[PDB]
């Protein structure tokens, strides 16, 4: 019973991304420590929009695969998922091996599952305060 | 790995940017420094770096944005105002406000310098064997537009409208006439037209 | 439930910037100490308008990224954000490395997150009295 | 909720300046000590009108920057602010380094913030009785 | 809430000057001691009208500068202030350095502020009984 | 870093300004001093500094505003009243109130001095081969406008209206006439017009 139309009300003009239930503040202060400022002002907004769009796509794929049913491109919301996947697959080639170097996982499937909160996070990983600062 | 020290403090953990092929990276100085080529840079001075791979910045260099080269087909050229004095990749001296064009015979791809301004992409003007055109303000042998004048271009010919120039009334078509058809036409200025042997 | 139309009522004539919930007095007395007078009368007003416009853009980006969705340029307020981003990207080149030299952070993303108040401020930093003088 | 139209009712004929909430008497007796009489009768009225116009402009800029939004030149009062800024930028060149020599601060931004009362005043400075003689 | 129209009811025919709230008697007996009779009968009336007009102009400038807004020349009373300033600036050149020699201050700005009563009067100065004889 | 002292007090922490290329910085004196070039300055005297980079002021120098040079294309010139006596970059002596023009043949970019006043940008007047114009108050050989007179300019020609001059009725077009067309025209003053051999 997640908001579906309310996501498309917040759909951006190009294809980039409460309705997510995630610590926003805490994630921005986490990425502030890792050195996102050194990628340029233009670069950090592109990277944050990339990570937000991957988070929305992982939320969509989690919503779909509970009923069983870059490759993700219902017929009524197929257009937004198609243009979001095309926005993902273009700007991802600018950043090879960016989820290890930003300390989020192996690849984007490992990163978005940990950031969404359905998969465990190890003690050797510093991603323990992204779900627990919202618990405080 | 890094072993710490009492009198040395880690400020931040900077991350490289990935320059792919047919791109370049613009990055200014925050302080009077030198770059990786070993050239002096004053504060605020921007420049481009054109090495492909991961590019790690220096401590004073700042990464502003990535720039991608423009691809030049035979039917397009590149209109470029100059921003200040420099010498381009072909090695000719430009001056402030000077405009020119870049074609395929120069390069297949051109990455726009920080000393240049992309004004637009100029599509080619092509004339058939039955077409002509009148160029307003044509460019003379000194490279400067001759204001006020005109120039009539006819034939199977294709060319670029250089900056300053303009077509008068578009691509026009030539008057073919049967022997049952004639034209009445007036002279504006004293002229000489020797189409045949006479004048 | 932030005021949206009330910001556009306070939109300036060129594209520069309660509705912000920040110590104004205290920030001006903070920047008075650091030597903003030596940049010229004309220069300090341009710099203060730059910092206010960056603060409004960071407030907008915080409002957007809680729902997930210089690079920032809703369709109904796209014009003001576009002209504000164009006003930012023109006058920023006059000031290279200005946020370290004014002691606000590494770059503008590090500075506006600390000045807005969602990210921590270290003890080695003098930005502790910009959020606590409003608490006194 | 400051009086806005009531300022324009007190707008002068050329562009020079309760509605200010400041010790008038005390400021005039302060400037009487520093030697304003030696600048000529014509000169001291020009200087007092300059300082009053800078005070009104600082009050306006404080009113604006609480909502976030010589360089200062709302659309309905843009004409008076424009002509006041043009009156400021003409006669300021007659007086180089006048705020140190009259003991008011470094420049006009340092002077009007102290005279308005939102910024601290040091003990080495004699500007302590301009806000406290009104408290007595 | 000072009387404004009641001043123009007492406006003289040439441009010279309760509504002032000042010891008249005491000021005339003060100036009688200093030797105003030796300036000629015609001269002393011209000097007294000069001092009264400067007092009215200082009262006007005090009334104006509490709201913030020879150089003094509201639109409805601009004509009387203009002709009074022109009457001041003509006959002032007859008397160079007259406020020291009559023991009233450095110049007219120092003199009218002390005679009006908003600024302190030193013990080395004999102007202590012009405000206190009205208190007795 | 700064180690303090008992008899020395830190007054403020001044910050440099960044002069980019094709700019300049105006800064006056607060006291009789010398500048970085080593020239005497009286109080209130303003001047310009044209070094690119971070420019840190001195203790008496004040930074008022940044000034940017004007770019001069072939179709624009620069109208400049003088403010007082000086010698410009070309090295000619000006006088107070004297006006003149700057063209591309002088410089591609001109940063307006503190001893100059930008009155406006003068676009070029261009005449076609079928156009003429009448200049009111033309500038003679002594550089001074000849008041009251006129001058008729005709042909394929482009030029700038120098200060003082004015076009009478705009760009006018010439009278071409067939052999079925004639003009009646009166003489205002005794004249001589030898178009052909006769007079």
Curated annotation (Swiss-Prot), chains A, C, D, E:
Residue ranges for the region (Interaction with the major vault protein) are: 1-136
**Annotated coiled-coil segments of the chain:** none
The entry's family comment says:
Belongs to the ARTD/PARP family.
Q: Give a brief account of the tissues where this protein occurs.
A: Widely expressed; the highest levels are in the kidney; also detected in heart, placenta, lung, liver, skeletal muscle, spleen, leukocytes and pancreas.
State whether it acts alone or in a complex, and with which partners, per the record.
Component of the vault ribonucleoprotein particle, at least composed of MVP, PARP4 and one or more vault RNAs (vRNAs). Interacts with TEP1.
Q: Where in the cell is it found?
A: Cytoplasm; Nucleus; Cytoplasm, Cytoskeleton, Spindle
* Listed name of the protein: Protein mono-ADP-ribosyltransferase PARP4
Function as written in the Swiss-Prot or TrEMBL entry:
Mono-ADP-ribosyltransferase that mediates mono-ADP-ribosylation of target proteins.
Q: Which domain of life is it from?
A: Eukaryota
From Swiss-Prot, chains B, F:
Q: Could you tell me which residues the MVP repeats occupy?
A: 16-68, 69-123, 124-174
Question: What is the annotated localization of this protein?
Answer: Cytoplasm; Nucleus, Nuclear pore complex; Cytoplasm, Perinuclear region
Its induction, per UniProt? Up-regulated by IFNG/IFN-gamma.
Disulfide cysteine pairs (residue numbers) = none
Q: Which domain of life is it from?
A: Eukaryota
Tissue and organ distribution:
Present in most normal tissues. Higher expression observed in epithelial cells with secretory and excretory functions, as well as in cells chronically exposed to xenobiotics, such as bronchial cells and cells lining the intestine. Overexpressed in many multidrug-resistant cancer cells.
Q: Where are the bilayer-spanning segments?
A: none
Q: Fill in the PTM field for this protein.
A: Phosphorylated on Tyr residues after EGF stimulation. Dephosphorylated by PTPN11.
Assembly behavior: The vault ribonucleoprotein particle is a huge (400 A x 670 A) cage structure of 12.9 MDa. It consists of a dimer of half-vaults, with each half-vault comprising 39 identical major vault protein (MVP) chains, PARP4 and one or more vault RNAs (vRNAs). Interacts with TEP1. Interacts with PTEN and activated MAPK1. The phosphorylated protein interacts with the SH2 domains of PTPN11 and SRC. Interacts with APEX1. May interact with ZNF540.
UniProt function note:
Required for normal vault structure. Vaults are multi-subunit structures that may act as scaffolds for proteins involved in signal transduction. Vaults may also play a role in nucleo-cytoplasmic transport. Down-regulates IFNG-mediated STAT1 signaling and subsequent activation of JAK. Down-regulates SRC activity and signaling through MAP kinases.
The record's comment about this protein's domains reads:
MVP 3 mediates interaction with PTEN. MVP 4 mediates interaction with PARP4.
Q: What is this protein called?
A: Major vault protein
Species name: Homo sapiens
């Amino acid at each position: 019973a997640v908001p579906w139309t309310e996501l498309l009300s917040l759909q951006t003009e190009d294809g980039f991304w409460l309705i997510l239930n995630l610590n926003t503040n805490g994630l921005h202060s986490f990425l502030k420590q890792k050195g996102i400022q050194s990628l340029g002002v233009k670069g950090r907004e592109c990277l944050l929009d990339l990570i937000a769009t991957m988070l929305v796509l992982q939320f969509i794929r989690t919503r779909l695969e509970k009923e069983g049913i870059m490759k993700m491109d219902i017929p009524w919301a197929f257009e937004a998922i198609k243009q979001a996947s095309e926005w993902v697959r273009r700007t991802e080639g600018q950043y090879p091996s960016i989820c290890p170097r930003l300390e989020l996982g192996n690849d984007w499937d490992s990163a978005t599952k940990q950031l969404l909160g359905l998969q465990p996070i190890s003690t050797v990983s510093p991603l323990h305060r992204v779900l627990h600062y919202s618990q405080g | 790995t890094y072993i710490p020290r009492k009198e040395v403090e880690v400020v931040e953990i900077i991350q490289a940017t990935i320059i792919r092929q047919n791109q370049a990276l613009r990055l200014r100085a925050r302080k009077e420094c030198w770059d990786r080529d070993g050239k002096e840079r004053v504060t605020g001075e921007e420049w481009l770096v054109t090495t492909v791979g991961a590019y790690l910045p220096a401590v004073f260099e700042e990464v502003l944005d990535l720039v991608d080269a423009v691809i030049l087909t035979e039917k397009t050229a590149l209109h470029l105002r100059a921003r200040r004095n420099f010498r381009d990749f072909r090695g000719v001296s430009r001056r402030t406000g000077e405009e020119w064009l870049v074609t395929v015979q120069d390069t297949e791809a051109h990455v726009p310098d920080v000393h240049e301004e992309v004004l637009g992409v100029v599509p080619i003007t092509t004339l058939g064997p039955h077409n002509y055109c009148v160029i307003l303000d044509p460019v003379g042998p000194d490279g400067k537009n001759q204001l006020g004048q005109k120039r009539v271009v006819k034939g199977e010919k294709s060319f670029f409208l250089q900056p300053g120039e303009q077509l008068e009334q578009g691509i026009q078509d030539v008057y073919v006439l049967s022997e049952q058809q004639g034209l009445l036409l007036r002279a504006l200025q004293p002229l000489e037209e020797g189409e045949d042997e006479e004048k």
